[PDB]
Amino acid sequence: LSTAILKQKNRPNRLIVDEAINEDNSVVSLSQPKMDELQLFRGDTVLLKGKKRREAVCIVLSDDTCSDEKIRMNAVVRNNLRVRLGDVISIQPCPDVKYGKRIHVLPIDDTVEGITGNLFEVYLKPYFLEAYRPIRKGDIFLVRGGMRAVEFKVVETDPSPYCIVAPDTVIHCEGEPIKREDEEESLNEVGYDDIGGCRKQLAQIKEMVELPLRHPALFKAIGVKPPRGILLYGPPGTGKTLIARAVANETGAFFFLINGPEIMSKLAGESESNLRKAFEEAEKNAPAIIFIDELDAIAPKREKTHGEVERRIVSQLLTLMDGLKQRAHVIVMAATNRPNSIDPALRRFGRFDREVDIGIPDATGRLEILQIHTKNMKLADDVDLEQVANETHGHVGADLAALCSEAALQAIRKKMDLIDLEDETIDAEVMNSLAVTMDDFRWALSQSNPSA
Amino acid sequence: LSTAILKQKNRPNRLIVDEAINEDNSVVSLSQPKMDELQLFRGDTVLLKGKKRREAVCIVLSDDTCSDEKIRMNAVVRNNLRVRLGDVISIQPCPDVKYGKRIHVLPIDDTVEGITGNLFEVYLKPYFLEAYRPIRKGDIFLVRGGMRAVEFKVVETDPSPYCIVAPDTVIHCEGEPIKREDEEESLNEVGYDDIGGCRKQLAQIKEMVELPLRHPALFKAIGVKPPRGILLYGPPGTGKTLIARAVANETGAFFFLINGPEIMSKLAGESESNLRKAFEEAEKNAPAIIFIDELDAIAPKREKTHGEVERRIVSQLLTLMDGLKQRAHVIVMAATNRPNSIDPALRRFGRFDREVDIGIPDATGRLEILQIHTKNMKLADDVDLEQVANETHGHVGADLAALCSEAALQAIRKKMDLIDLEDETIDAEVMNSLAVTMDDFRWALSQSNPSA
Numbered sequence: 064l065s066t067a068i069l070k071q072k073n074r075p076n077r078l079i080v081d082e083a084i085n086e087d088n089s090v091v092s093l094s095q096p097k098m099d100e101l102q103l104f105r106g107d108t109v110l111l112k113g114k115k116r117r118e119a120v121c122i123v124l125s126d127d128t129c130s131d132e133k134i135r136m137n138a139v140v141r142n143n144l145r146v147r148l149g150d151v152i153s154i155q156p157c158p159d160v161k162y163g164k165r166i167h168v169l170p171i172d173d174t175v176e177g178i179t180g181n182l183f184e185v186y187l188k189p190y191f192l193e194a195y196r197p198i199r200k201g202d203i204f205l206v207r208g209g210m211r212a213v214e215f216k217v218v219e220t221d222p223s224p225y226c227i228v229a230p231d232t233v234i235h236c237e238g239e240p241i242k243r244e245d246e247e248e249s250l251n252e253v254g255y256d257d258i259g260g261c262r263k264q265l266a267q268i269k270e271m272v273e274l275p276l277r278h279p280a281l282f283k284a285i286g287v288k289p290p291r292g293i294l295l296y297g298p299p300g301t302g303k304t305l306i307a308r309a310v311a312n313e314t315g316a317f318f319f320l321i322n323g324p325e326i327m328s329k330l331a332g333e334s335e336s337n338l339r340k341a342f343e344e345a346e347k348n349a350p351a352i353i354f355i356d357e358l359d360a361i362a363p364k365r366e367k368t369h370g371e372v373e374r375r376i377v378s379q380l381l382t383l384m385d386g387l388k389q390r391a392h393v394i395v396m397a398a399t400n401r402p403n404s405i406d407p408a409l410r411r412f413g414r415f416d417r418e419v420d421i422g423i424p425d426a427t428g429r430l431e432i433l434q435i436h437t438k439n440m441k442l443a444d445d446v447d448l449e450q451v452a453n454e455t456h457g458h459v460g461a462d463l464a465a466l467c468s469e470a471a472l473q474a475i476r477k478k479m480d481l482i483d484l485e486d487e488t489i490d491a492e493v494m495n496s497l498a499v500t501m502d503d504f505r506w507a508l509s510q511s512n513p514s515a
Numbered sequence: 516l517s518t519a520i521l522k523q524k525n526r527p528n529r530l531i532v533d534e535a536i537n538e539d540n541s542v543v544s545l546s547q548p549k550m551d552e553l554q555l556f557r558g559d560t561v562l563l564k565g566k567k568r569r570e571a572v573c574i575v576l577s578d579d580t581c582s583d584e585k586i587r588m589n590a591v592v593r594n595n596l597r598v599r600l601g602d603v604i605s606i607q608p609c610p611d612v613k614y615g616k617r618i619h620v621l622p623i624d625d626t627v628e629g630i631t632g633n634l635f636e637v638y639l640k641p642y643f644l645e646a647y648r649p650i651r652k653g654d655i656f657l658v659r660g661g662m663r664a665v666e667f668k669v670v671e672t673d674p675s676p677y678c679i680v681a682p683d684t685v686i687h688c689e690g691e692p693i694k695r696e697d698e699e700e701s702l703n704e705v706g707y708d709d710i711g712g713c714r715k716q717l718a719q720i721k722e723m724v725e726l727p728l729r730h731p732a733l734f735k736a737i738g739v740k741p742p743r744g745i746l747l748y749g750p751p752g753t754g755k756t757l758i759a760r761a762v763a764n765e766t767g768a769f770f771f772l773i774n775g776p777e778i779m780s781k782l783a784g785e786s787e788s789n790l791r792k793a794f795e796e797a798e799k800n801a802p803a804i805i806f807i808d809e810l811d812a813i814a815p816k817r818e819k820t821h822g823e824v825e826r827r828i829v830s831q832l833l834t835l836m837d838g839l840k841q842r843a844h845v846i847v848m849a850a851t852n853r854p855n856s857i858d859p860a861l862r863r864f865g866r867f868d869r870e871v872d873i874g875i876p877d878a879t880g881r882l883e884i885l886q887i888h889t890k891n892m893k894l895a896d897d898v899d900l901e902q903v904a905n906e907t908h909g910h911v912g913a914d915l916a917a918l919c920s921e922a923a924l925q926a927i928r929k930k931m932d933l934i935d936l937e938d939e940t941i942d943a944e945v946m947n948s949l950a951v952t953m954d955d956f957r958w959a960l961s962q963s964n965p966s967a
C-alpha cells in the first residue's frame with residue numbers, strides 16, 4: 064500500500080540468479096526464449112546490476128538446462144554483484160565497450176603466500192589470451208595455475224569503469240598485495256538487506272530521499288516541492304546509523320556523512336568550516352545526501368546550551384538548510400535518539416520537516432534482525448531463531464546483536480577445555496566444531512537487558 | 516563453568532617449580548622421562564615463562580632426584596620468573612639464540628657499598644668465563660667474589676631481549692648503581708595474584724580483552740565481532756586501578772594508560788592531542804589495550820558540564836571510539852566509581868558496550884584481600900585472618916589495605932619503648948621481633964571505617 068515503492072516489480076530483464084554450467088568468470092547464461100525477448104544475440108557483452116551499487120560485465124550465451132526467468136552465473140560473478148543464488152538482478156544490453164589498453168590488477172595476500180615466480184605469466188596471460196574478456200573496475204576474479212588458484216582485484220581500467228581485454232591490453236600487476244581484511248570490509252559493507260524490522264521506514268526513506276533525487280521529474284510534473292530534511296529518530300540502538308551506512312552504500316546519490324561528535328571534537332570555527340565544506344561539497348556533486356549522524360550533538364536547543372561556539376553552530380546549520388535553493392537537489396538526512404533535545408527551529412517547515420520513526424522492532428523485526436546477525440555464524444541444528452525473537456520483547460537491533468555476540472562467547476566458553484589463552488594459536492579441529500547451540504542463546508537470553 | 520577461562524590446563528611443558536640441586540644461575544633441571552617427551556636434549560638453551568610477563572633463558576640438564584612433573588631452579592631464576600616454589604611455569608624449546616657482542620650490566624647499590632676495586636674483574640669475568648651463559652634483559656643475577664656476593668641487573672643486550680654470553684661479548688658495567696628501591700617497585704609490580712575477590716570479574720576481563728586480542732581467529736571463525744569498550748565500575752577502592760595495573764603487567768597486548776585527571780590537567784587542545792596520541796599509539800602497536808582510568812573525569816554528561824573545552828573532549832573521545840575500524844585489534848578499557856555520571860553516548864553499542872562490575876567483596880573476597888595484603892607482613896602465630904574477614908562487612912579492598920596498615924602501626928606503637936624518633940637508625944634486635952599480633956588487628960578493627 065505505502066510499502067509500494069519497495070515492491071520487486073516484474074520485468075523482462077529482472078532474472079533469478081541460478082548456478083552456472085559454464086564455469087568461466089566472463090560468462091552468464093540465459094534460456095533461448097529469454098535472449099530473443101531482450102534482443103540479445105550470442106556473444107554480446109552485457110551489463111549486470113547487482114545489490115549495493117555493484118555491477119559486472121559479461122558475455123551472454125544460450126542455455127538449454129537454464130529456465131526462462133533465470134540467469135546462470137558462477138560464484139565469482141555472484142560475488143562481484145554481491146548476490147546469493149536466487150536473488151534478482153537486472154541484465155542490460157551493453158554494446159558500448161571499448162577495448163582497454165591499460166589494466167591494473169592485484170592479487171589477494173592470503174591467496175599468494177610462497178613463490179611469486181611471475182604472476183602475469185603463470186596466471187594472467189593464460190586467463191586473458193585471445194579471450195576478449197569483459198571486466199569492471201572492482202571485479203574480484205579467480206585464476207587457476209598449476210599448484211593452486213589466486214584471487215585478483217581489478218584496481219584500474221583504461222576506459223572509465225569497464226573495458227574488453229583485447230590482446231592490445233597492457234596488464235599491469237606490479238604493486239602491493241591487496242589485504243584480505245579490506246575486501247572482507249568491502250563484502251560486509253552494509254546494505255538494505257543488513258537492516259531488519261524497518262520495512263515501512265525503509266519505504267519512507269526511498270520515498271523521501273531516493274525518489275526525489277533520482278526522479279525529480281515526478282515532483283516537478285505533479286507540481287509539488289520535494290521535502291529536503293529527513294530526521295530519523297528512535298531509541299538507542301534501533302538502526303539509525305546502520306540505515307545511514309545502508310543508504311550510503313545503496314544510493315545512486317553522492318553521500319556525505321557528518322558525525323555529530325566528529326564536528327564538536329574540532330576547534331572553534333574549524334567545525335563551522337567543516338559544516339560549510341560538507342554543504343558546499345554536496346551542492347557541487349549534483350544529486351546528494353547529507354547525513355548528519357547524532358544531530359542532537361550539533362543542534363541542541365539554543366536555550367539549554369552554554370557555549371557561544373555551540374550556539375553559533377546551530378545558527379551555522381540553519382543558515383545552510385535555508386541556503387540550499389530548490390534547484391540544489393540535496394536532501395539532508397539526520398539521526399538522533401533524543402529528537403526532543405534538538406532546537407525546534409531546525410524541525411520547522413523546509414528544514415527537517417519530515418520524521419522517520421525507527422522504533423522498537425516487533426516480533427517479526429527481531430526475527431529479521433537475528434537472521435541478519437547470524438548469517439555468518441555457525442549455528443547448530445537445534446537453534447530456533449523464531450523462539451529467540453519471541454523471548455526478546457524489549458530488544459532493539461543493538462541488543463540482539465549483543466545477544467548473538469554473547470551466545471557466541473558461551474559456545475567459546477563450552478570449548479575452553481581444548482582452548483588455552485597461553486597457546487600461540489587455537490587447535491584446528493576445535494575451530495571447526497564451533498557451533499552456537501540454542502542452549503547458548505538461552506544463556507545469552509538469561510543475561511540479556513533492554514536499555515529503554 | 517564461566518570461570519573456565521581461568522583454569523590451569525595440564526600440558527607436557529607446564530611444570531611445578533622445585534628447589535635446584537644444581538645451584539648455578541643459568542641452569543634448570545628436569546627428569547629424564549620429561550626431557551624425552553618435550554624433545555629437549557642435554558645442554559639446550561630453553562625459554563621459561565613465569566608470572567606477570569616475566570621470562571628467563573636457561574640451560575636444561577637431566578636430574579634423577581627431580582620428579583617428572585617438576586622443574587628444579589635456584590632462587591635467582593625463581594626471582595626472575597617472579598615465582599615462589601610450587602608455581603606453574605612454561606618450558607619452551609629455544610634454539611634461536613645468537614651470541615651477544617655487547618651486554619650492559621649494573622650492580623645493585625646496597626650490595627656494593629665499600630671497595631669497588633674492579634667489578635668486572637672480581638665478579639663478572641669469573642661468572643661468564645667460557646660459561647656460554649644465556650641471559651635475558653631485566654634478569655637480576657647474583658655473583659660471589661671473595662668477601663661477599665653482589666647482585667647485578669641486565670640493563671641492555673646485543674640481540675633484542677636475550678643472548679648467549681660467548682667469550683666474544685663485551686660486558687659493559689660502567690654506570691650508576693641500580694637503586695634497590697627501583698627493583699623492589701619492579702618485584703612488587705601488580706599482577707593477577709595481587710588482586711583478590713574478583714575471580715569472576717577477572718574471568719570477564721580475560722574473555723572480553725585478552726581472548727579477542729590474542730586469539731581473534733575464534734571470533735572471526737564463529738562469525739562474531741569482538742566487543743571493543745569495557746567499562747569497569749564500582750564503589751571507591753574496589754580494585755579498578757589495581758586491575759588496570761595487573762592487566763598492564765600481565766597482558767601480551769601493548770598497553771596504554773590514560774589517567775582521567777592527567778588528561779584534564781593539561782592545556783586546552785594539548786589534552787585533545789594527548790588523547791589523539793594515545794589512540795594512534797595503540798593503533799600503531801597492533802594488538803593493544805587502552806585503559807582510561809577515572810573515565811568520569813574526561814567524559815561527564817555533556818549536559819552537566821559547563822566548559823567548552825570539556826564538552827569538546829567528550830566529543831573527541833566518542834570520535835576516537837568510533838574511529839577504530841574492525842581490523843584495528845584495539846580494545847578500550849575504562850574505570851569509574853560514578854558510572855552514571857558518564858555521558859550515555861559513550862555507553863552505547865560499539866563504544867563502552869560492556870560493563871564489568873568490580874563490586875564490594877564478600878566474606879571470601881575479604882579473606883583473599885587480607886591474604887594478599889599480609890604476604891610481605893610479619894604476622895604472629897595467633898593472627899586469624901578469617902576472623903578479620905568476618906568482622907569487616909562494609910570493607911572494600913582499600914579499607915582492608917588501610918586496616919592492615921594500621922594494625923602494623925599499632926605493632927610499631929607497642930615497640931615504641933625500644934624505639935626513638937631522635938635516633939639515627941633503629942636497633943637491630945627490635946626490627947626482627949616486629950610481628951603484627953591479632954590484638955593489633957582488633958585495635959585496627961575498632962578504629963576502622965567504611966567510606967560511609
Ligand SMILES: Nc1ncnc2c1ncn2[C@@H]1O[C@H](COP(=O)(O)OP(=O)(O)OP(O)(O)=S)[C@@H](O)[C@H]1O
Binds near residue numbers: 257260303306432464
Ligand atoms: N534494525 C536493525 N537491523 C539490523 N541490525 C541492527 C538494527 N538495529 C541495530 N542493529 C545492529 O546494532 C548495531 C547498532 O545499531 P546502530 O545503527 O549503531 O544504532 P543507532 O540506531 O545508530 O543508535 P544510536 O542512536 O546511535 S545510540 C548495528 O551495527 C547493527 O549491527
Ligand SMILES: Nc1ncnc2c1ncn2[C@@H]1O[C@H](COP(=O)(O)OP(=O)(O)OP(O)(O)=S)[C@@H](O)[C@H]1O
Binds near residue numbers: 712757916
Ligand atoms: N579486590 C582487591 N584485591 C586486592 N587489593 C585491593 C582490592 N581492592 C583494593 N585493593 C587495595 O586497595 C588499593 C586501592 O584500590 P584501587 O584499585 O586504587 O581502587 P579503585 O577501585 O581504583 O577505586 P577508585 O574508584 O579509584 S576510588 C589497591 O592499591 C590495593 O592495595
Ligand SMILES: [Mg+2]
Binds near residue numbers: 755756850
Ligand atoms: Mg581507582
